[PDB]
Amino acid sequence: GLMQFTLPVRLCKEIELFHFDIGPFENMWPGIFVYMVHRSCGTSCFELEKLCRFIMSVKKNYRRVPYHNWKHAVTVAHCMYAILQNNHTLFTDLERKGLLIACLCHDLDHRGFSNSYLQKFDHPLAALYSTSTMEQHHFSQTVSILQLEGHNIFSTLSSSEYEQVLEIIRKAIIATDLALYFGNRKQLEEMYQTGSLNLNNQSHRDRVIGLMMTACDLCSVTKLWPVTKLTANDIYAEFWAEGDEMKKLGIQPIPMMDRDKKDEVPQGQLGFYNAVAIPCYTTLTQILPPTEPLLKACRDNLSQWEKVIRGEE
Ligand SMILES: CC(C)c1nnc2c(C(=O)NCCc3nc(-c4ccccc4)cn3C)cccn12
Ligand SMILES: [Mg+2]
Ligand SMILES: [Zn+2]
Secondary structure, three states, rough: OOOOOOHHHHHHOOOOOOOOOOOOOOOHHHHHHHHHHHHOOOOOOOOOHHHHHHHHOOOOOOOOOOOOOOHHHHHHHHHHHHHHHHOOOHOOOHHHHHHHHHHHOOOOOOOOOOHHHHHHHHHHHHHHOOOOOOHHHHHHHHHHHHHHHOOOOOOOOHHHHHHHHHHHHHHHHHOOOOOHHHHHHHHHHHHHHHHOOOOOOHHHHHHHHHHHHHHHHHHHHHHHHHHHHHHHHHHHHHHHHHHHHHHHHOOOOOHHHHHHHHHHHHHHHHHHHHHHHHHHHHHHHHHHHHHHHHHHHHHHHHHHHHHHHHOOO
């Protein structure tokens, strides 16, 4: 009832900032997330015994892969917490509840392979889900864990609020398929610029929540340079393992995934900052002005990759 979560002073202050790193102590990630739900939503959004049991079943269903792991899940939820606290009054009680859970669950049971590799391997999940393969699997696993005895954190919601929140989570999670991002942002751009963008239109909200999810998912590019640089080793370690597996199938992987082409990482990160990250955080700042720090930090790390290419580090 009267049981707050508190953090040490440095975390209490730094958790409010977009660039916050959740640190190397795994056993504090759960308390960090609960802290965020309580400040974002209220101490009464979720029955604490159910929330805790949900958090630990979710953790157990992330795998020990280099990048798409439990640490990524809590990183992406933290970024969503930063967005929600800097845009307090633009979001319903249900959106606040659904979106933090959506981020924690958004890569459940990820095996460290692209939708592409599932399809070329002919993995069962590719027959069951022809597009957004892993992301439909991630949502599926969220519903599984919600249905476990003592895990329904949404038990108090009305029959209809329950369906609305699971629909918020489904779209939120589908949106983390980067193939769907390019379309979603082009439309969000055109709607903002012609002035058609309207946040009372539910299909316009959907698109905005979609872009928030891509922002939160990419937030490793908005960290202090040494966090951004080291995280890149993790994500390339998956990409190269996939490359190896593509070669095992008799297929030349794209350069991104070919560990023979390590040399070209800086140029590839440049490409990705220009094609993906900068556009994302640009359009997000236009739509939601207080998210500007994500854009500014992204721009800083781009400049840090330009420096790497010029032999200046
Ligand atoms: C940490 C998080 C935020 C993160 N980082 N990257 C990503 C990507 C992604 O598409 N990355 C690859 C960028 C890239 N590399 C090459 C390359 C490299 C070496 C040799 C040759 C070509 C090419 N291109 C385009 C997707 C989702 C989250 N990501
Ligand atoms: Mg994913
Ligand atoms: Zn992710």
